[PDB]
Coordinates of C-alpha atoms in Angstrom, one line a residue:
Chain A
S5 CA -1.9 -14.8 8.8
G6 CA 0.2 -11.6 8.9
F7 CA -0.8 -8.0 8.8
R8 CA -0.1 -5.1 6.4
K9 CA -0.8 -1.7 5.6
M10 CA -3.3 -2.5 2.8
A11 CA -4.8 -0.2 0.2
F12 CA -7.9 -0.7 -1.7
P13 CA -7.7 -2.1 -5.4
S14 CA -7.6 1.1 -7.3
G15 CA -9.0 -0.2 -10.7
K16 CA -12.2 1.5 -10.1
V17 CA -10.8 4.9 -9.6
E18 CA -8.2 4.4 -12.2
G19 CA -10.7 4.7 -14.8
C20 CA -12.0 8.0 -13.5
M21 CA -8.5 9.8 -13.6
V22 CA -8.2 12.5 -16.1
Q23 CA -5.8 15.3 -16.8
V24 CA -7.0 19.1 -16.5
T25 CA -5.1 21.8 -18.0
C26 CA -5.9 25.6 -17.6
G27 CA -3.4 28.1 -19.0
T28 CA 0.0 26.9 -17.8
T29 CA -1.1 24.6 -15.0
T30 CA -1.7 20.9 -15.2
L31 CA -3.0 18.9 -12.3
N32 CA -5.6 15.8 -11.8
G33 CA -9.3 15.6 -12.2
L34 CA -11.9 12.9 -11.5
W35 CA -14.3 12.0 -14.2
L36 CA -17.7 10.8 -12.8
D37 CA -20.4 10.7 -15.5
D38 CA -20.4 13.7 -17.4
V39 CA -18.6 16.0 -14.6
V40 CA -15.0 16.4 -14.0
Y41 CA -14.0 17.3 -10.8
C42 CA -10.7 19.0 -9.8
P43 CA -8.9 21.7 -7.5
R44 CA -9.9 25.1 -8.3
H45 CA -6.3 26.6 -8.2
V46 CA -5.8 25.1 -11.8
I47 CA -6.8 28.6 -12.8
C48 CA -4.0 30.0 -10.8
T49 CA -0.4 30.7 -11.8
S50 CA 2.4 30.6 -9.4
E51 CA 2.2 34.4 -8.6
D52 CA -1.5 34.1 -7.9
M53 CA -1.4 31.7 -5.2
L54 CA -0.3 34.0 -2.6
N55 CA -3.5 36.0 -2.7
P56 CA -5.7 34.7 -5.2
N57 CA -9.3 36.0 -5.9
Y58 CA -10.8 32.7 -7.4
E59 CA -13.9 34.3 -8.4
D60 CA -12.2 37.2 -10.1
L61 CA -9.8 34.7 -11.8
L62 CA -12.8 32.6 -12.9
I63 CA -14.6 35.2 -14.8
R64 CA -11.5 35.6 -17.2
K65 CA -12.0 31.9 -18.2
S66 CA -14.4 30.1 -20.6
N67 CA -15.3 26.6 -21.2
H68 CA -12.7 26.6 -24.1
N69 CA -9.9 27.2 -21.8
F70 CA -10.1 24.0 -19.9
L71 CA -8.4 21.1 -21.8
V72 CA -9.3 17.7 -20.4
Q73 CA -7.3 14.8 -21.2
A74 CA -8.5 11.1 -20.5
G75 CA -5.7 9.1 -22.0
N76 CA -6.1 10.1 -25.6
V77 CA -9.7 10.8 -25.4
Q78 CA -10.6 14.7 -25.7
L79 CA -13.5 15.7 -23.6
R80 CA -15.3 18.6 -24.7
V81 CA -16.2 21.3 -21.9
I82 CA -19.7 22.6 -21.9
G83 CA -20.0 24.1 -18.7
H84 CA -17.9 25.0 -15.5
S85 CA -18.7 26.1 -12.0
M86 CA -17.0 26.9 -8.4
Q87 CA -18.4 24.8 -5.7
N88 CA -16.3 26.0 -2.4
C89 CA -12.8 25.1 -3.6
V90 CA -13.4 22.6 -6.5
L91 CA -14.0 23.0 -9.9
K92 CA -16.9 21.1 -11.9
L93 CA -16.3 21.1 -15.5
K94 CA -19.6 19.7 -17.5
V95 CA -18.5 17.5 -20.3
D96 CA -20.6 16.2 -23.1
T97 CA -19.6 12.5 -22.6
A98 CA -20.4 10.5 -19.6
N99 CA -17.6 8.4 -18.4
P100 CA -18.3 4.8 -19.7
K101 CA -16.0 3.4 -16.7
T102 CA -17.8 5.2 -14.0
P103 CA -18.7 2.9 -11.1
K104 CA -21.5 3.4 -8.3
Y105 CA -20.0 6.1 -5.9
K106 CA -20.9 8.3 -3.0
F107 CA -19.3 11.4 -1.8
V108 CA -18.5 11.1 1.9
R109 CA -17.1 13.6 4.4
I110 CA -15.0 11.6 6.6
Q111 CA -14.1 11.8 10.4
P112 CA -10.8 12.3 11.8
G113 CA -9.1 9.1 12.6
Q114 CA -10.7 7.2 9.7
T115 CA -8.5 5.7 6.9
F116 CA -8.5 5.9 3.0
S117 CA -6.6 4.8 0.2
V118 CA -5.0 7.4 -1.9
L119 CA -4.3 7.0 -5.9
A120 CA -1.2 9.2 -6.4
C121 CA -1.4 10.6 -10.1
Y122 CA 0.5 13.0 -12.3
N123 CA -0.8 14.4 -15.5
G124 CA -3.6 12.2 -15.1
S125 CA -1.8 8.9 -14.9
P126 CA -1.8 6.6 -11.7
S127 CA 1.5 6.4 -10.0
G128 CA 1.0 4.5 -6.9
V129 CA -1.5 3.5 -4.2
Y130 CA -1.2 3.7 -0.4
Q131 CA -3.2 3.9 2.7
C132 CA -3.3 6.6 5.3
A133 CA -5.4 8.3 8.0
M134 CA -7.1 11.6 8.6
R135 CA -4.9 12.8 11.4
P136 CA -6.9 14.4 14.3
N137 CA -5.8 17.9 13.1
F138 CA -7.3 17.2 9.6
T139 CA -4.0 16.7 7.9
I140 CA -2.5 13.6 6.1
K141 CA 0.6 12.4 5.8
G142 CA 1.0 11.0 2.5
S143 CA 3.5 11.4 -0.7
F144 CA 2.5 14.3 -2.9
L145 CA 5.1 15.7 -5.3
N146 CA 4.6 18.4 -7.6
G147 CA 1.8 18.1 -9.8
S148 CA -0.3 15.5 -7.6
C149 CA -3.0 18.0 -6.9
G150 CA -6.5 16.4 -7.5
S151 CA -5.5 12.9 -6.8
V152 CA -8.2 11.3 -4.6
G153 CA -8.8 9.3 -1.5
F154 CA -11.4 6.7 -1.2
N155 CA -13.0 3.6 0.2
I156 CA -14.5 0.8 -1.4
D157 CA -17.7 -1.4 0.2
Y158 CA -18.2 -4.3 -2.4
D159 CA -19.1 -2.5 -5.4
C160 CA -19.3 1.3 -4.4
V161 CA -16.5 3.6 -4.3
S162 CA -16.8 6.3 -1.5
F163 CA -14.7 9.4 -2.4
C164 CA -13.7 11.4 0.6
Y165 CA -10.5 13.2 -0.1
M166 CA -9.0 15.2 -3.0
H167 CA -5.3 16.7 -2.5
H168 CA -4.8 20.4 -2.9
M169 CA -2.1 21.6 -0.9
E170 CA 1.5 21.0 0.6
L171 CA 1.7 22.7 3.9
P172 CA 5.4 24.3 4.6
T173 CA 5.8 21.9 7.3
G174 CA 5.6 18.9 4.8
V175 CA 2.4 17.8 5.6
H176 CA -0.7 17.5 3.2
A177 CA -4.2 19.2 3.0
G178 CA -7.0 18.9 0.8
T179 CA -10.8 18.8 0.5
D180 CA -13.8 16.5 0.2
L181 CA -15.5 16.4 -3.0
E182 CA -17.8 19.0 -2.2
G183 CA -14.9 21.4 -2.2
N184 CA -14.8 22.1 1.6
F185 CA -11.1 21.8 3.3
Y186 CA -10.9 19.3 6.1
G187 CA -9.6 21.3 8.9
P188 CA -9.0 25.5 8.7
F189 CA -6.9 25.2 5.8
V190 CA -7.2 27.7 2.6
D191 CA -5.9 27.1 -0.9
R192 CA -3.5 29.9 -0.5
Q193 CA 0.4 30.0 -0.2
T194 CA 0.8 31.3 3.1
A195 CA 1.8 30.5 6.7
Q196 CA -0.9 27.8 7.7
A197 CA -0.6 26.6 11.4
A198 CA -1.4 22.9 11.9
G199 CA -2.9 22.3 15.3
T200 CA -1.3 19.9 17.9
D201 CA -1.9 16.5 16.2
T202 CA -2.9 13.5 18.9
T203 CA -2.4 9.8 18.5
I204 CA -5.5 7.9 17.3
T205 CA -6.2 5.9 20.6
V206 CA -8.7 3.5 19.3
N207 CA -6.6 2.7 16.3
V208 CA -3.6 1.8 18.4
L209 CA -5.8 -0.5 20.4
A210 CA -7.3 -2.2 17.4
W211 CA -3.7 -2.7 16.0
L212 CA -2.7 -4.3 19.3
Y213 CA -5.9 -6.8 18.6
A214 CA -4.4 -7.8 15.4
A215 CA -0.9 -8.2 16.9
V216 CA -2.4 -10.7 19.5
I217 CA -4.5 -12.4 16.5
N218 CA -1.2 -12.9 14.5
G219 CA 1.1 -14.0 17.4
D220 CA 2.5 -11.0 18.7
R221 CA 2.0 -12.0 22.5
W222 CA 4.6 -10.2 24.5
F223 CA 3.0 -6.8 25.6
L224 CA -0.2 -8.3 27.4
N225 CA 0.4 -8.0 30.9
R226 CA -1.4 -8.5 34.4
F227 CA -2.7 -5.1 34.8
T228 CA -5.9 -3.6 34.4
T229 CA -7.5 0.2 34.2
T230 CA -10.5 2.2 34.2
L231 CA -11.5 4.6 31.7
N232 CA -10.6 7.8 33.5
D233 CA -7.4 6.3 34.7
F234 CA -6.2 5.6 31.3
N235 CA -7.4 8.9 30.0
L236 CA -5.1 10.4 32.4
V237 CA -2.2 8.6 30.9
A238 CA -3.5 9.5 27.4
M239 CA -3.2 13.3 27.5
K240 CA 0.3 12.9 29.1
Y241 CA 1.3 11.3 26.0
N242 CA -0.9 13.3 23.6
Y243 CA -3.4 10.4 22.9
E244 CA -7.1 10.9 22.2
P245 CA -9.2 10.5 25.0
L246 CA -11.1 7.1 24.8
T247 CA -14.7 7.3 25.0
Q248 CA -17.4 4.4 25.7
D249 CA -18.1 4.7 21.8
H250 CA -14.6 3.8 21.2
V251 CA -15.0 0.6 23.6
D252 CA -17.9 -0.2 21.6
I253 CA -16.1 0.0 18.4
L254 CA -13.8 -2.8 19.7
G255 CA -16.3 -4.9 20.8
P256 CA -16.0 -7.5 18.1
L257 CA -12.3 -7.6 18.6
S258 CA -12.7 -8.0 22.3
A259 CA -15.1 -11.1 21.8
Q260 CA -12.7 -13.0 19.2
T261 CA -9.4 -12.5 21.3
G262 CA -11.0 -13.0 24.7
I263 CA -9.0 -9.9 25.9
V264 CA -11.2 -7.3 27.7
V265 CA -10.5 -4.1 26.2
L266 CA -9.5 -2.4 29.5
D267 CA -7.2 -4.8 29.8
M268 CA -5.7 -3.8 26.5
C269 CA -6.0 -0.2 27.7
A270 CA -3.6 -1.4 30.6
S271 CA -1.1 -3.0 28.0
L272 CA -1.0 0.1 26.2
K273 CA -0.5 2.3 29.3
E274 CA 2.5 0.1 30.4
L275 CA 3.9 0.5 26.8
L276 CA 3.7 4.4 26.9
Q277 CA 5.1 4.6 30.4
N278 CA 7.9 1.9 29.8
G279 CA 8.8 2.2 26.0
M280 CA 9.0 -0.9 23.7
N281 CA 12.4 -1.9 25.3
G282 CA 13.8 -2.6 21.7
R283 CA 11.3 -5.0 20.6
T284 CA 8.8 -5.1 17.8
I285 CA 5.0 -5.5 17.3
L286 CA 4.0 -6.6 13.7
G287 CA 7.3 -5.4 12.4
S288 CA 7.0 -2.0 14.0
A289 CA 8.9 -0.3 16.8
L290 CA 6.3 2.4 17.2
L291 CA 2.6 2.0 18.2
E292 CA 0.8 2.3 14.8
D293 CA -2.4 4.4 14.7
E294 CA -3.3 4.0 11.1
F295 CA -5.6 1.0 11.4
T296 CA -9.2 1.3 12.3
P297 CA -11.0 -1.4 13.9
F298 CA -12.9 -1.8 10.8
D299 CA -9.6 -2.2 8.9
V300 CA -8.4 -4.8 11.5
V301 CA -11.5 -6.8 11.0
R302 CA -11.4 -6.9 7.4
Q303 CA -7.9 -8.2 7.1
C304 CA -8.4 -10.8 9.7
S305 CA -11.6 -12.1 7.9
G306 CA -10.7 -12.0 4.1
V307 CA -13.3 -9.4 3.2
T308 CA -13.4 -8.7 -0.9
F309 CA -14.8 -6.5 -3.1
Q310 CA -16.5 -7.1 -6.5
Chain B
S14 CA 7.4 15.5 -0.6
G15 CA 6.7 12.7 2.0
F16 CA 7.7 9.1 1.6
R17 CA 5.3 6.1 1.6
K18 CA 5.3 2.2 1.2
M19 CA 3.6 2.8 -2.3
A20 CA 2.1 0.0 -4.4
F21 CA 1.5 0.0 -8.0
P22 CA -2.0 0.7 -9.5
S23 CA -3.6 -2.8 -9.6
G24 CA -6.3 -2.0 -12.1
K25 CA -4.2 -4.1 -15.0
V26 CA -4.0 -7.2 -12.8
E27 CA -7.6 -7.0 -11.2
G28 CA -9.0 -7.8 -14.8
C29 CA -7.0 -11.1 -14.8
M30 CA -8.0 -12.4 -11.6
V31 CA -10.4 -15.4 -11.6
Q32 CA -11.9 -18.2 -9.6
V33 CA -10.7 -21.7 -10.0
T34 CA -12.5 -24.6 -8.4
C35 CA -11.2 -28.2 -8.4
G36 CA -13.4 -30.7 -6.4
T37 CA -13.9 -28.7 -3.0
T38 CA -10.7 -26.8 -3.0
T39 CA -11.2 -23.0 -4.4
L40 CA -8.3 -20.7 -4.7
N41 CA -7.4 -17.8 -7.1
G42 CA -6.2 -18.0 -10.8
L43 CA -4.9 -15.7 -13.4
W44 CA -6.1 -15.2 -16.7
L45 CA -3.7 -14.2 -19.3
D46 CA -5.0 -14.5 -23.0
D47 CA -6.5 -17.9 -23.2
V48 CA -4.7 -19.7 -20.4
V49 CA -5.3 -19.6 -16.7
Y50 CA -2.6 -20.0 -14.3
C51 CA -3.1 -21.4 -10.7
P52 CA -1.2 -23.2 -7.9
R53 CA -1.4 -27.0 -8.6
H54 CA -2.5 -27.9 -5.2
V55 CA -5.9 -26.8 -6.3
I56 CA -6.4 -30.5 -7.1
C57 CA -5.5 -31.7 -3.3
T58 CA -7.7 -32.2 -0.4
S59 CA -6.7 -31.2 3.1
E60 CA -5.6 -34.9 3.8
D61 CA -3.5 -35.1 0.5
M62 CA -1.3 -31.9 1.2
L63 CA 0.9 -34.0 3.8
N64 CA 2.5 -35.9 0.9
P65 CA 0.9 -35.3 -2.4
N66 CA 1.6 -37.3 -5.4
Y67 CA 0.7 -34.5 -7.6
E68 CA 1.2 -36.6 -11.0
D69 CA -1.0 -39.4 -9.7
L70 CA -3.6 -36.7 -8.4
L71 CA -3.8 -35.0 -11.9
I72 CA -4.6 -38.3 -13.8
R73 CA -7.9 -38.6 -11.7
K74 CA -9.0 -35.5 -13.3
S75 CA -10.2 -34.3 -16.7
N76 CA -11.1 -30.9 -18.3
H77 CA -14.5 -30.7 -16.9
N78 CA -13.5 -30.9 -13.2
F79 CA -12.0 -27.4 -13.6
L80 CA -14.5 -24.7 -12.8
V81 CA -13.2 -21.2 -13.6
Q82 CA -15.2 -18.1 -12.3
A83 CA -14.4 -14.7 -13.8
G84 CA -17.0 -12.7 -12.1
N85 CA -20.2 -14.3 -13.7
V86 CA -18.3 -15.4 -16.9
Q87 CA -18.0 -19.1 -17.2
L88 CA -14.7 -20.3 -19.0
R89 CA -14.9 -23.7 -20.5
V90 CA -11.6 -25.5 -20.0
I91 CA -10.4 -27.3 -23.0
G92 CA -6.9 -28.4 -21.9
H93 CA -4.8 -28.8 -18.6
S94 CA -1.0 -29.3 -17.9
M95 CA 1.5 -29.2 -15.0
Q96 CA 4.5 -27.1 -15.4
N97 CA 6.5 -27.5 -12.2
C98 CA 4.3 -26.2 -9.4
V99 CA 1.7 -24.5 -11.5
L100 CA -1.3 -25.6 -13.5
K101 CA -2.0 -24.2 -16.9
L102 CA -5.7 -24.3 -18.0
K103 CA -6.4 -23.8 -21.5
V104 CA -9.6 -22.0 -21.8
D105 CA -11.8 -21.1 -25.1
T106 CA -11.8 -17.4 -24.7
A107 CA -8.9 -15.1 -24.5
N108 CA -9.1 -12.4 -21.7
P109 CA -10.4 -9.1 -23.2
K110 CA -8.7 -7.4 -20.7
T111 CA -5.1 -8.8 -20.9
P112 CA -2.5 -6.1 -20.7
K113 CA 1.0 -6.5 -22.2
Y114 CA 2.8 -8.7 -19.6
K115 CA 6.2 -10.5 -19.0
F116 CA 7.1 -13.4 -16.5
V117 CA 10.1 -12.4 -14.6
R118 CA 11.9 -14.4 -12.0
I119 CA 13.1 -11.6 -9.7
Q120 CA 16.1 -11.6 -7.3
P121 CA 16.2 -11.5 -3.7
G122 CA 16.2 -8.0 -2.4
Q123 CA 13.5 -6.7 -5.1
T124 CA 10.2 -5.3 -4.4
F125 CA 6.9 -6.0 -5.9
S126 CA 3.1 -5.3 -5.1
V127 CA 0.8 -8.0 -4.1
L128 CA -2.9 -8.1 -5.0
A129 CA -4.5 -9.9 -2.3
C130 CA -7.6 -12.1 -3.7
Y131 CA -10.3 -14.5 -2.2
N132 CA -12.4 -16.6 -4.4
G133 CA -11.2 -14.7 -7.3
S134 CA -11.9 -10.9 -6.1
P135 CA -9.4 -8.5 -5.0
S136 CA -9.3 -7.7 -1.5
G137 CA -6.3 -5.2 -1.2
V138 CA -3.0 -4.0 -2.4
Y139 CA 0.3 -3.8 -0.7
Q140 CA 4.1 -3.7 -1.4
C141 CA 6.5 -6.3 -0.1
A142 CA 10.1 -7.4 -0.9
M143 CA 11.8 -11.0 -1.5
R144 CA 13.5 -11.6 1.6
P145 CA 17.1 -12.6 1.1
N146 CA 16.1 -16.2 2.3
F147 CA 13.3 -16.2 -0.4
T148 CA 10.3 -15.7 1.5
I149 CA 7.9 -12.7 1.7
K150 CA 6.4 -11.1 4.9
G151 CA 3.0 -10.5 3.7
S152 CA -0.9 -11.1 4.5
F153 CA -2.4 -14.2 3.3
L154 CA -5.4 -15.6 4.9
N155 CA -7.1 -19.0 4.1
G156 CA -7.9 -18.8 0.4
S157 CA -5.5 -16.5 -0.8
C158 CA -3.3 -18.9 -3.1
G159 CA -2.7 -18.0 -6.7
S160 CA -2.5 -14.1 -5.7
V161 CA 0.2 -12.7 -7.7
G162 CA 2.9 -10.2 -7.1
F163 CA 3.9 -8.0 -10.1
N164 CA 5.7 -4.8 -11.1
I165 CA 4.5 -2.3 -13.8
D166 CA 7.1 -0.4 -16.1
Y167 CA 4.6 2.3 -18.0
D168 CA 2.2 0.0 -19.9
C169 CA 3.8 -3.7 -19.4
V170 CA 3.0 -5.8 -16.2
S171 CA 5.6 -8.1 -15.1
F172 CA 4.5 -10.9 -12.9
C173 CA 7.1 -12.2 -10.8
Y174 CA 5.2 -14.1 -8.1
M175 CA 2.1 -16.2 -7.2
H176 CA 1.3 -17.2 -3.6
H177 CA 1.4 -21.0 -2.5
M178 CA 2.0 -21.4 1.1
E179 CA 2.2 -20.1 4.6
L180 CA 5.2 -21.7 6.5
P181 CA 4.4 -23.0 10.1
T182 CA 6.5 -19.9 11.2
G183 CA 4.0 -17.4 9.7
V184 CA 5.9 -16.1 6.7
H185 CA 4.9 -16.9 3.0
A186 CA 6.3 -18.9 0.2
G187 CA 5.6 -19.0 -3.4
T188 CA 6.6 -19.4 -7.1
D189 CA 7.4 -17.4 -10.2
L190 CA 4.8 -17.9 -12.8
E191 CA 6.7 -20.8 -14.4
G192 CA 5.9 -22.9 -11.4
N193 CA 9.6 -22.9 -10.0
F194 CA 9.5 -21.9 -6.1
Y195 CA 11.4 -19.3 -4.8
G196 CA 13.9 -20.9 -2.3
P197 CA 14.0 -24.6 -1.1
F198 CA 10.2 -24.7 -0.5
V199 CA 7.8 -27.4 -1.9
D200 CA 4.1 -27.3 -1.9
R201 CA 3.7 -29.9 0.9
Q202 CA 2.4 -29.5 4.4
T203 CA 5.6 -30.5 6.5
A204 CA 8.4 -28.9 8.4
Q205 CA 10.3 -26.4 6.1
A206 CA 13.2 -24.6 7.4
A207 CA 13.8 -21.1 6.4
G208 CA 17.2 -20.0 6.2
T209 CA 18.8 -16.9 8.2
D210 CA 17.3 -14.0 6.9
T211 CA 19.6 -10.8 6.5
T212 CA 18.7 -7.2 6.2
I213 CA 19.0 -6.0 2.4
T214 CA 21.7 -3.2 3.2
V215 CA 21.6 -1.7 -0.4
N216 CA 17.5 -0.9 0.3
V217 CA 18.4 0.4 3.8
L218 CA 21.0 2.9 2.5
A219 CA 18.4 4.0 -0.4
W220 CA 15.7 4.4 2.2
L221 CA 18.4 6.8 4.1
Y222 CA 18.8 8.8 0.9
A223 CA 15.0 9.2 0.8
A224 CA 14.8 10.5 4.2
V225 CA 17.6 13.1 3.5
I226 CA 15.7 14.3 0.4
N227 CA 12.5 14.8 2.5
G228 CA 14.3 16.6 5.4
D229 CA 15.1 13.8 7.9
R230 CA 18.7 15.1 8.9
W231 CA 19.6 14.0 12.1
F232 CA 21.5 10.7 11.3
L233 CA 24.2 12.1 9.0
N234 CA 27.4 12.4 11.1
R235 CA 31.1 13.4 10.4
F236 CA 32.3 9.8 9.9
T237 CA 33.4 7.9 6.8
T238 CA 34.2 4.2 6.1
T239 CA 35.4 1.7 3.7
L240 CA 33.9 -1.1 2.0
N241 CA 35.5 -3.7 4.0
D242 CA 35.2 -2.1 7.3
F243 CA 31.5 -1.4 6.9
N244 CA 31.2 -5.2 5.8
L245 CA 32.6 -5.9 9.2
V246 CA 29.8 -4.2 11.0
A247 CA 27.5 -5.9 8.4
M248 CA 27.9 -9.4 9.4
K249 CA 27.7 -8.5 13.2
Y250 CA 24.4 -7.2 12.7
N251 CA 23.4 -9.8 10.1
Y252 CA 23.3 -7.0 7.2
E253 CA 23.9 -8.1 3.6
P254 CA 27.3 -7.6 2.3
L255 CA 27.7 -4.4 0.3
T256 CA 29.5 -4.8 -3.1
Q257 CA 30.6 -2.2 -5.5
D258 CA 27.6 -3.1 -7.7
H259 CA 25.6 -2.1 -4.9
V260 CA 27.5 1.3 -4.5
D261 CA 26.9 1.9 -8.4
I262 CA 23.1 1.2 -7.8
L263 CA 22.9 4.1 -5.3
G264 CA 25.1 6.3 -7.8
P265 CA 22.1 8.7 -8.9
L266 CA 21.0 8.9 -5.2
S267 CA 24.6 10.2 -4.4
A268 CA 24.7 12.5 -7.1
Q269 CA 21.4 14.5 -6.1
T270 CA 21.9 14.4 -2.5
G271 CA 25.7 15.2 -2.7
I272 CA 26.4 12.6 0.2
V273 CA 29.0 10.0 -0.9
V274 CA 27.7 6.4 -0.6
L275 CA 30.4 5.6 1.8
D276 CA 29.6 8.4 4.0
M277 CA 26.1 7.4 4.1
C278 CA 27.7 3.9 5.2
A279 CA 29.1 5.6 7.8
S280 CA 25.8 6.8 9.1
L281 CA 24.4 3.2 8.8
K282 CA 27.2 1.8 10.9
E283 CA 26.8 4.6 13.6
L284 CA 22.9 3.7 13.8
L285 CA 23.5 0.1 14.0
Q286 CA 26.0 0.5 16.8
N287 CA 24.2 3.2 18.7
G288 CA 20.8 2.7 18.1
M289 CA 18.3 5.2 17.2
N290 CA 17.9 6.9 20.8
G291 CA 14.2 6.9 20.3
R292 CA 14.0 9.2 17.2
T293 CA 12.6 8.2 13.9
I294 CA 13.2 8.3 10.2
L295 CA 10.4 8.9 7.7
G296 CA 8.0 7.8 10.5
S297 CA 9.6 4.6 11.4
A298 CA 11.7 3.7 14.5
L299 CA 13.4 0.8 12.7
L300 CA 15.9 0.7 9.6
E301 CA 13.5 0.0 6.6
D302 CA 14.9 -2.5 3.9
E303 CA 11.8 -2.7 1.7
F304 CA 12.6 0.2 -0.7
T305 CA 14.8 -0.5 -3.7
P306 CA 17.2 2.4 -4.9
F307 CA 14.9 2.2 -8.0
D308 CA 11.9 2.5 -5.7
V309 CA 13.2 5.6 -4.0
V310 CA 14.2 7.3 -7.4
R311 CA 10.5 6.5 -8.6
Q312 CA 8.8 8.3 -5.7
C313 CA 11.2 11.2 -5.7
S314 CA 10.6 11.8 -9.3
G315 CA 6.8 11.2 -10.1
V316 CA 7.2 8.4 -12.5
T317 CA 3.8 7.1 -14.0
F318 CA 2.3 4.4 -15.9
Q319 CA -0.1 4.4 -18.5

């Protein structure tokens, strides 16, 4: 019993993190087999980041300008290439600690764990969510670029995110491991508008189910609602519209707790309209939206990995 | 920038977790050199846990009743012994993945990371704090006993906690790795009163400093206070009394932000007396007390390990 914002065991990913240095810029890279992945702005200086011609900047470099550090191992660089916004450095040694992995482009509202790294050394591990506006609300100090987000399914690591940028608003943007940014952001130091961020409604509902499972009882009322009627209250408070697909996502949690999904929607409607009156739900005074329904089922069942 | 409840990289500890089976009970053990550490109630059945004579139960066992599983490695057990509330199983093979480690008895208000495990397989990683009443508010489903809490200082793992028990109130109790319980709890299935839990005042203040560092501005007022006058408001709201030692703990954070510690105390006094008016502080609508001042300095400086 009890419910925590729990991140994946980062051991599999710790063994892949390296240090990539190009000229006078040092960030993190990811070492999978004989390829190192890292943000392409490692080739930029501070002045370059305002309007960088990444192609032109890359011709000025050859393989021997990239110094890759895995602890104290020297990786020789035998080839380099740009794929969208990431660099792929061919190294002559396959990583002996490479786990089975996938590259996955995640959808908004999904969650993943972040291994914050600096100079190739792991610092901390925390969970976050891909906000509906494709940003993430993490902790990324100077030198954290190249840190990766991931999920684990038993023995396989699913890499979904690599950090690139701190927006001038304080939120964080990055790419998948094919180099494509999530959202409209570009690896350039300019004004970048982040769209309106809505609350992930299906995640809040799943977190309400985890509270009922763990004894938080007080917010279930005697009301019910319809999909279109709850969706009316949704846009009022900038919540994501609930679809039938979201209802079926919550199917298993509805089965165990015996509370119909639309009845849980009525409890959410009353929480949005009436506030929380100073009470808490799983140690929280807000409505939490960083738990996917798959996250709730995992913690409430003891699913492990390896 | 940004501030997260961040746990240590659990790779060093993942390589020490094993599965310990005695009769029909299966929990987790910790494999350091040629010794496996695990809770002593692995030798109990469900009926035994109400009034177990652990000594008498241990004579009925010999070395070949303990089946230790590290992934698919079979560890032979060549000796067993009780130290307080933990079992020490001598195995004939030293763990090749043993990091440098210490056993540490932590003080209340300190924080550590928890690697939740089931049947010897890591499930998740999260940070928590030793509450002033020596409980912890974690997530421990059935089969999580033996999971350990730890801190990392560069290359050395400081083991401080191993989980033993879920109280009938839903909170969690356990021991240090010498087998001594934190608090008055006993590995027995009975009514166990948990004392009044106060809020860790020095941790809330340090979390207020991290908010100022990261732009949360609104709660700093034009008031100041004294130690005894703030301590008056402390016991009203069940906060820990602040001592001069706590003030000096916050010294470095007072130096960087330029806000005197007692001025931050005045801001806390106004937050306790006036509520929060519906605003947030680092994405939180309550006053967070699970961040030690050493935790704040780490995240705000980029301290890494290995």
